[model samples]
Every structure is written in C-alpha cells, then in structure tokens.
Target chain A: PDEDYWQAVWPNTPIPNTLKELLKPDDTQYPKTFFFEHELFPGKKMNMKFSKIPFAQPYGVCVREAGKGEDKYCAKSLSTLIGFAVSKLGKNIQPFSSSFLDKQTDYTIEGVHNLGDKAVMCHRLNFQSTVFYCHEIHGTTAYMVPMVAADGRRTQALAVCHHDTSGMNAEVLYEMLKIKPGTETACHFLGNKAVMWVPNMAVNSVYNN
Target chain B: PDEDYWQAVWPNTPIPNTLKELLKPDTQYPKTFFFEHELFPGKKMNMKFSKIPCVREAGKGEDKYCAKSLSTLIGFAVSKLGKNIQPFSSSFLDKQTDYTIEGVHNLGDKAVMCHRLNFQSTVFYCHEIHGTTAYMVPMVAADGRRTQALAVCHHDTSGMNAEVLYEMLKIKPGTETACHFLGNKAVMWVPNMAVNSVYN
Candidate 1:
C-alpha cells in the first residue's frame, strides 16, 4: 500500500557544501531507502513512507552518542514521541521556526537573549526512516538576527551558537570555526524542518534597556 | 564508530482513527495531500485558526495569534518580547524528501515563527502563541527507509476541529489536549523567562 505513494522520490534540497563535504563523505551515512517531503506536491493524499539509516558525519562537530542530557528516540511512533516531549516540556509548549532561506546581507543584531535561556532544540535527521535528535544543552544560545537581503527581502534568521564545545569533534565544525572545544561558541540558522519549544512566557530581552 | 547495522520493531499503526473518518468521502479525487484543505485552505478556516482580523487584540477564544503582514508580525513580537522581537523563518523545502534533516537553533523565547506557503516569493504565515511545544521526531517508513521528521504537539485544542479528537486519538474537545507531527513546514514562538532577570 505504501508502494503506491512510494513512486515519488525524495525532493532535492541544498545542503551547504560545508555540511555535505563534512557529513556525506562515506556510505555509512548514505541511506538505502529514505524518502520525505519538505514542500507540497500533487498526489493522492501522498500518504508516503519514511525510513531510517545511520550517519557518520556531524553537522558542526557535535555528537553521536547519548551524551549531554539530550532526549533521543530512533524510529518511534509519532504518538509515543509526542508523549515523551510533552512529558518533559509540559503541555503548553509552543513550536517555533525561522523564515525560509531568507539570506540577507544587511541587518542589525536585535536584542537576542532571554529566549528561554534554558530550553530544548530538536532536529530531524536524514535516514531510510524518520528520527528526531532532541537535546537540552546548557551552553547554547539562540539568536534572532533581523536582515534586509540585497534581493529586497526582509526577515529574521534564527541562529544558535553553542557555548560549550569542550567535547566537540575538533575535526568537524570545531575545526572550520577555529573553535576550541569547551571554550568557544558555535551557531547555525534553524532550518525549516526544525522546531523549538520553550515556556510560553515573555522574558525581558538580554538587551532590554 | 556510528555502529554497524541495527533493527527495531515496527508498531502496528492503526491507520489513525482520523484517517478512517476521512474515508467516508466521495471517490472523486485520490486522498493525497489531505492537509491542503486544513493548512492551506487559501481563503478558509472555520474560525478554526484564521490569520487574524488585520491587527488588534486576541480573539475571545484565542490564546495565541498569527500575523499576516510583516508590520503586524514585528509589532506583535516587539510588544511582547521587546524592540528586539525579530521575525525569523527557514528556507522553504522546495519539495525535498524526508531523508534530509537540518538543525534549527534557538532564537530565544521572545521570537516570532512563520511559514512560507503556496510558494509566495515573500508571503508568510507568521505565528506566536502562549501555549505550545516543538519537537524533532524519528519515523519509520512502510518500505523500511528511515529518517528524522519535524512535528509539533498542540496544547490548545478548544477551537480546533471537534471530531478531530475522535479521529486521530480517542479524546474529545474541551476534554483533553493533543499533539501530532506537523507536515514539514511550520514555525512557533515561546516567551523569554529570564528576560527580566537578565535585564535587571
């Protein structure tokens, strides 16, 4: 039955060369049969299926083990997964994302802290199946950079810099960023497939005058 | 090492009680992209979760609000977070497959989440609410392919589709809250708890 909708293959989205060169160099991370949708397409309910696989590359010199008090589940039912997050974060947790590819050259750094100084960041990993890597690290900070792209585009980009890189891979992003593990900060913009959950109460900005 | 190869059990997904409810439909069009009617209803929503009435106060029953205009989006965030409540979003999927997953860092609690739908060059569905949670879930495919997925579990269900509870889960409205995996493109917001402490 899933084969009917399975005719459609995965969509081709751009992964920065910086990421691909570091993460997809070997077949270990290569998926055998993985598929998913990042945008809408015409189909019969497209009730497609997603699979999972293992990865060898780290996005920014991060981790592969279950360290850092992070929450992890590989190939679990959506219902069961929700039960876990709600169990940890509570019921009234709001899901948030950054704008789509709103790359800009001109913008100012807005008051960027107080966004749940302590919170969790969950991400989708590519595989033959679907799995989410969610963790609550204490040394990471999220940023809201307002930008005005030369293309006449205006929007905010959410970038998170990791403060505690003491245990970083030293060979991946930690190398590219000249970041000394356990002594520096590394950040990245949130992709469309990622969601952030924090307590829903406004906090005075770290920049509030 | 990442590990050789591993296997896990696949649960018997009962096709979702929600999927069954939609089965009682006419056989004119194949039931693909069912959310088009719910998410991208264009000019729709049963007061379900409309964008907003231009810009004003929250609705009588609304706990969170969404902004259509950039001005409104910025205004909403600024009023709540500070002159620093910036609007943010990720690049559109442009029709990508599930095998790909990207990391979305944090933007503090005082931020606005938005979505770019219908391939509008600059148009977006910006939202921010009081009660909500974000998650990254891993899923299994019918064919056994594996990948990580993005989703959100909603807490406020009072204004949602009534029978929705009956179909997806065995819960009813005004009775219990619910959560589910959101179709790829979505954004959300939370309040900054230490905004004052950090400032003071």
Candidate 2:
C-alpha cells in the first residue's frame, strides 16, 4: 500500500556543505521547545509565545479536484470534515454558522504517521450538498491548532505545504514537509522572521533515526 | 583625561574575517559597514565607515587594511551584544530570560574583557521588550577595573532586527541633576580602555 511514495531513499542522500554548516549544532544553546495538541472551535482564540510553529494552512478546504479511483484523494468522511471546517474556520466565512457544517457531505482520513512525540493526521472533506457544493477533493494539510495560554503572547498556528486536490497522505507530507526537530531550528526559508518551535522529543528523533 | 584612553592606536589591528562577515552590511552593500555607537551620557548613534578587508600582511600599505578590519570587527562584536535581544523563554519560569557571553580584546589598550550579560524580557509576536542587568571586569589586565549598570531597550517591529543595546556614562563627581537623563536613572563612570564596555 505504501509502494507509491516510499521508493525514494532520502535519508542517505548527500546534503550540501553550506546547509551542513547552517544546521544548528547539538551543543548550541537554545530556548525550550514543546509540543502542543488541541481541539478548537470557530471564534475561539489560541495564544502562544513561540519562536516558530509549523502547520498546514486552511486553504482549499471546500474545493475538490476532478479525478477518481484509489489514486484520487477523497475526504475521510463528509460529516467529520464539514464539522471540523465549520468549527475551525466557520466564523471567518461570511454568513457563516454552525448550521453550514450540517449540509456538508463526503469525508475520510488519507493517512496517519506515528511521529512519536506527535501523531501526524490528515482529514479531508468532500461536499455535494446545498448552501455550497464541493467536489470529492482530498487535501494534504498539516495544522498545529492554536490554543490559549496563560502568558499574553502572540496567537495563531503555522501551516505547511497545501496542495489543492492532491492524494498524497499525511505520512508522505510528514516525510516531505515535516521539519525534523533539530536539523535547523530556524527556518528562514519559511519566509517568516518568526522561527518555528519544535519539541525536544522531535529533535531527538533526528539523532535517533 | 581622554588622552589616556585615546592614545592606543587600536584603529589598526588584525581581526578574524569570520567575525567580520557577521557584521551587518550597510545600504551600500560591499563598500560600507555600519556599526552602533554608544555615546557618553547614554545617547545611541550609528557609526559608518568604508568596508575594510581582513587579510594577512600581504606587504606594504595592506597592513592598514588589516588594522581597519580588526577595528571594525571589534566594534561589530561589541555593538551586536548591546543591541536589543530576545531572551530564551524559560521552561521552568513564567518569563523570558537571556544570557550570553563573549571574550574580546579591549581595542583601546591590550587588555581582556570577559563580557557577560543577562536580562529579563518578554516577547510578543511582532515585537519584544527587554532590560539588561550586566557587570564586567577587565580580565587579564594589570589595572583591574570593574563596572556594573542596567539598560532598557525595545526590539522594534522593523528597522534593526537585532536587539538594541543601550548606552551608559559615569555621572560627574558631586553632580545630581543629570542623573535622570533617561527617566531618572543614576549614572556614574570610571573604567578601563575598552570604550565599548561602557555600553553595559
């Protein structure tokens, strides 16, 4: 079942010297890193003071690509997908209401990865109902749902690679987009000045691997 | 009085290029370099100069290049330390704390200053607020001198991405009015040749 994406041997490939030099040394003193998991609903706010956070953006949640068969990515289940969409982003959409999720159809989980410190999850939604219509689309999205904190820090989660109508599962995305904890603590490539936060367990995973 | 500290020709010395490269480039890019200057009485300013290359003594005249590079390198290192910095958020504590140290030569005279500084800070998404509690000693110098001070700074949303190190100066003997220059803070001085050390 994993044959389509597991062919490439990326771990052993040679990395550029410049990149090696840029990698944070193990001994480098760094701020504390932690992992967070949460369940959120629309209109709720999550606050945090982290250097960086990697997550999947909330884009193309309602659109589905025109394709079919096992190769095509479909929603894990319409009910759960629509429920998450409205709960996560419903308030932002105009004329939005919790009722909107009631009309969504089609859903499914594309893949899951045992990242140890955190589990990689994928949820897709396909809508063919009223009020709005969406194709049988599957999105490979990663999200670190923002949650509230005692300290008055910034709020908002980070998102990574969001391709419209792609069948790639969360496992594939984890391997491709997941920034293994310690390789580089600061990813200027994310194009954001705010560096990403990582869990210590995740950082240790790189060395353990 | 200033003659004692100004006599040392530190303007011409050799500094490691690796450290020099870390110096932020100016608007002119490769030609000019800009460094933060901490003036007496606690006023901060930007100092600019032509970029100086750090190469071994390749022979006549080039010795001047080595000196200028060395001088700029020293200034760059010191200025970076003083600039606004984000503290490492403590896991055990509720507030952010920053601590760092560097060992550099006192360009003014041949002396060593083990620069150590730490502070409490808070970081917001777009900006940060910080204050420093620092102390210094001219290590490895015959004329041992010690100094201590406090500084407050802000990391702006834009402009210099690095931390802003505030300036400091010694109060005139028996003077009291100028003590409250920046919000009623007492000032005093009497230090060794490292002019940059005053920034703490």
Candidate 3:
C-alpha cells in the first residue's frame, strides 16, 4: 500500500545519504560510523547524558526540507500526512481545516515549533483529510533538535535534512520507516507540533480503498 | 546502578502503574507503557496505526517530576537526598541552559510560532548561568471544540534514554519525527478559528 504511493511520488523527491554522510563527521565527539543506522536516522543523533545531574536528558537533531517563500508548503505537507496518519491510527489526532491563503487551498494547522530561527516543528491538526506522498519534493530543508530529560539529566536527538523532488532514495527511507509498531511512545513534552502524515492505507481507506 | 537511584527517589515521588494495569483491553492498538512507582509518572498509548500508512509515525512520550512548575520545588528535599546518594549523573545531561521567569534571568533563545490562530509553539532554551528555564512549549490545543496535533518529537541513538528511563517504556517515534528529522513527508490542513483554550 505504502509502496504504490511512494512509487508514484518517490520519483519526484530529493536524494538521500547515510546519516554519516549527512552529518559532517568533524562535528561529532566520537566518529559514529553506524549508530544512526542502528538506532538513529540518517540525519538524527540520540546520545545519553549519563554522569550528569539534576536530570538525565537526551538531545535529538532533525533535518528536512522546508519553505519556498512566505508559505511553508513543504512543511505543511509533511505535517498533514503525519497528523492524518496518527488520527487514522486512533491516536486523537486533530481534524483537517481548510482556508484560502492568497487564494491557495493552503491546508494549514497549528502546533508547530521552531529550530533555531529558520526551521519549525510540524503540528498540523484540525484538518479533515490529508494524503501522504511516497516522495514529494516540495522545498527547503527541515530540521528538528530535541532534548529529553531523565533522572535529572539530558538525552539528545539531532537531525539534518534536505528537500525531495521525485528523486528520493526510497530504498533507504523505506527501510528507515519500517519500525516495530507499539514499541514507541508519543508524548507532548510541549504539546503537538502538528506533523501530520496519514499512511497511504488511511488515504486509501478514506477514499474508499 | 539504576536500582540505586531508583531506591532513593522511589520514596519521595508518587509511582504510577505497569503495562498490565496500563494497557486497555478491546483497544487492539499497540502502545508503549512507562511504569513509574510515582502516580505522576507513567505514559500509555496503543499503536493502532501499525497497519496504516502515514499513521505509523511515532513520537516519544516522556514523564518529568514537575520541574517546570511549582510542583518542582516540592521535590527539592528529595532532589537533595537523591543528589547525595547518586550525586546526579550530570555527565552529558548538564544543563546547557536553565532559568526561571520573573527572576534574575530573562528568557533565552525564546521563539514562538502561531498557526491558524489556534496552535502556537514556543521554546525558551535556558542557561541557568543565564537564569531562565530554557523552555519551549508549542500550544496547539484549539481554544474550542476543535483538536490540534501537539508533538514534541525527539531523535536519539545513544540509547542514553533506553538506559536511564528504560523503566519508562518507549519505542521508535514510528515515522521517526517525520518533518523534524527524516525529511519525510509532512503537511497541515487546519481551519481558521478563534485561539483560546476554550473556543466557542
């Protein structure tokens, strides 16, 4: 199901590389040759903060495609898809709301966060319907840098990304997306960032698959 | 090592339940359960989107000891005692920033994003030396009957969290924080509406 949509859209996305290639090796403390593949994504970093105090936290880094101008069309698309998917999965995801932004259908939502100043988190709830493109390459690079705390210290997750344009290396991402379900947790340390992406199945079902 | 810290903080904090008590029957959805002896802890959610497409994306749900508000102070004495026994594993977790509002420190790297007048995400990256809670909270709960997506997704590979908070069950944030990191597909389809905790 996911493969069909991706097959159609994947060709219209961007290219990808291993996490090591995505992350400038010089920036790391100990060169990570295979950590991202095993536990992290191509552009993400998750490190433990043991030996620290007051709290144990994790640092997360994210990178992806983003805005072409005043409209963050790329960002919005990603959010819509994820939000729709969660909702389809029975996770209280918000409904889809539509409007005219300068005359564009402009599907927009709330609950997005910022990374430094150029990037923001996706929180696209309040929409009624959304479609997930296997590999839609719309625009800019989006990134997410997050920190989780435990035992009074910090755990880190980091990421880096680029836009897709029908050239997405799906084989890489497909493997990355195949996760062992129910093994993850969804919490709002600070509310949702509206990252909506309904799986192709939901889209299929929504449209009478 | 983990047992040592658990035994110490175990007394002060209120504990929650384990997966058995947490998981709901008839839900059929897959979920990650965090067991905290403290009632204030423990986070549970089933993974109903497993067979779905875009719905498979997952985010980390974490639990804290009221460090963001006044409830945090209640743990001060307990914190002190824990600090003594464990001495704080403050290695990599050292505060890159920390500060309180209305105090010696002003907000640091504070940023905000308001969406369709319903959702707003904010963060205050703190440096205690700078004096304010480096806080970032994205408020997207529509001020009315509508619902919004609010996810603070994190990415990590060090297994640091897997080690420390292992008791607080977790799994990969399905699509892996889609927009935040993977460069995965994302979009938003929200309608314009009033912005408040309770909209009419």
**Candidate that scores best on TM-score:** 1
| Candidate 1 chain A weakest lDDT stretch, 10 residues | A35-44
Roughly what TM-score does model 1 have, to 2 decimal places?
0.33
* Candidate 2 chain B, run of 10 with poorest lDDT: B179-188
Q: Rate residue B176 of model 3 by lDDT.
A: 25
Q: lDDT per prediction? A: 0.37, 0.22, 0.22
Tens digits of lDDT, candidate 3, A49-165: 122211111111112333334333322343344333443344322222111112121111111122211323333222232321222213322222223232333222222232222
How much is B193 displaced in model 2, in angstroms?
33
Q: Which ten residues in a row have the lowest lDDT in candidate 1 chain B?
A: B1-10
Q: Give the TM-scores of the predictions, in the order they appear.
A: 0.33, 0.18, 0.18
Order of quality (DockQ):
3, 1, 2
DockQ of each: 0.02, 0.01, 0.02
In candidate 2, position A137 carries an lDDT of 21
Query: How far is A207's C-alpha from truth in model 3 (Å)?
Result: 43
